């Protein structure tokens, strides 16, 4: 709960010298008590903080605080909420589904700080953000490529969740499950008309995330090398 304590401290400091109003600091204090009292989760803390920041239009200061404390989960949640609000302003359904899946995966990661679902959600949100940028830019090829990447991410997310879950206790050989997950992702992605290229790089990023989360990167390195040979 050190990140939450630092966030509360920095929000006080900010509210002490002008900047954000007092309501956000009071909410930070109450939620910091409730968490570590064992009555809510960090996801509810961050969600309430982001909702109040959006209500008061002070989200930039909250972003700066989350960068200063050095939190990736909360920052990704902030980006997800802002992107969802912007898409709701736009009103496009496929990005609605994409961001809802990203938020659900973010919540599941927040439950236990599982880095792989964090990687998946990060991929989804950054590709969606690039989609919105290209919407005003007007480069259709790039938006189609980003939709291909997002389809690959949607296909892979249950697969990476399952791979991590099985490796947790079942005891298989990570590299074998990593290779099977990557091949399944490629096959299912090409079953949707998407090249076996950019989906390959999506699977590569997710393999890197699995290696980081599982604490074993040599197997992730080997699967990365085989995928690099495959794209050739």
Residue 107 as a binder of a second copy (CB under 8 A): the answer is no
Beta-carbon contacts of 109 under 8 Å, excluding residues fewer than 6 positions away, are 73, 115, 116, 117, 118, 121
Among 58, 147, 198, 230, binds a second copy (CB under 8 A): 230
Residue 225 burial (CB count, 10 A) = 10
- Examine residue 85 and tell whether it contacts a second copy (CB under 8 A): no
Among 3, 26, 35, 44, binds Zn ion (CB under 5 A): 44
Contact criterion met (CB below 8 Å) for 153 and 164: no
Half-sphere exposure of 198 (CA within 13 A, CB side): 16
d(CA 151, CA 102): 12
Kindly tell me which residue out of 3, 5, 85, 142 binds a second copy, with binding defined by CB under 8 A: 5
Among residues 35, 58, 75, 179, the one that binds a second copy under rule CB under 8 A: 179
Asked if residue 113 lies in contact with residue 76, where contact means CB atoms within 8 angstroms, the answer is no
Smaller CB distance to a second copy: residue 12 or 161? 12
Please tell me whether residue 230 adopts helix, strand or coil conformation: helix
Q: What's the half-sphere exposure (Cβ side, CA atoms, 13 Å) at 25?
A: 14
CB of residue 90 to a second copy, shortest distance in Å: 25
Q: Is 22 in the site for Zn ion (CB under 5 A)?
A: no
* x-marked contacts with a second copy along 25-64 as a string, rule CB under 8 A: -x--xx-xxx--x-xx---x--------------------
Instruction: Name the residues that contact a second copy, by CB under 8 A.
Output: 5, 8-9, 12, 16, 26, 29-30, 32-34, 37, 39-40, 44, 173, 175-176, 179, 211, 217, 221-222, 224-226, 228-230, 232
């Amino acid at each position: 709960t050190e990140k939450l304590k630092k966030i509360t401290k920095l929000l006080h400091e900010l509210v002490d010298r002008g900047e954000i109003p007092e309501e956000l600091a009071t909410l930070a204090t109450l939620l910091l008590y409730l968490v570590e009292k064992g009555l809510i989760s960090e996801f509810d803390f961050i969600e309430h903080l982001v909702r109040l920041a959006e209500k008061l239009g002070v989200l930039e200061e909250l972003k700066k605080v989350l960068e200063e404390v050095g939190d990736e989960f909360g920052l990704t949640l902030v980006y997800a909420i802002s992107l969802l609000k912007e898409v709701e302003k736009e009103g496009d359904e496929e990005l609605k589904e994409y961001v809802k899946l990203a938020i659900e995966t973010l919540k599941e990661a927040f439950e236990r700080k599982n880095y792989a679902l964090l990687v998946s959600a990060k991929i989804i949100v950054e590709n969606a953000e690039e989609i919105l940028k290209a919407k005003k830019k007007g480069d259709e090829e790039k938006i189609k490529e980003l939709l291909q990447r997002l389809k690959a991410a949607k296909i892979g997310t249950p697969l990476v969740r399952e791979v991590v879950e099985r490796y947790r206790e079942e005891g298989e050989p990570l590299l074998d499950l990593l290779l099977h997950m990557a091949e399944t992702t490629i096959r299912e992605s090409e079953k949707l008309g998407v090249d076996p290229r950019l989906a390959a790089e999506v699977a590569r990023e997710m393999v890197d995330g699995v290696g980081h989360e599982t604490g074993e990167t040599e197997a992730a390195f080997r699967v990365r090398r085989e995928l690099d040979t495959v794209i050739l």
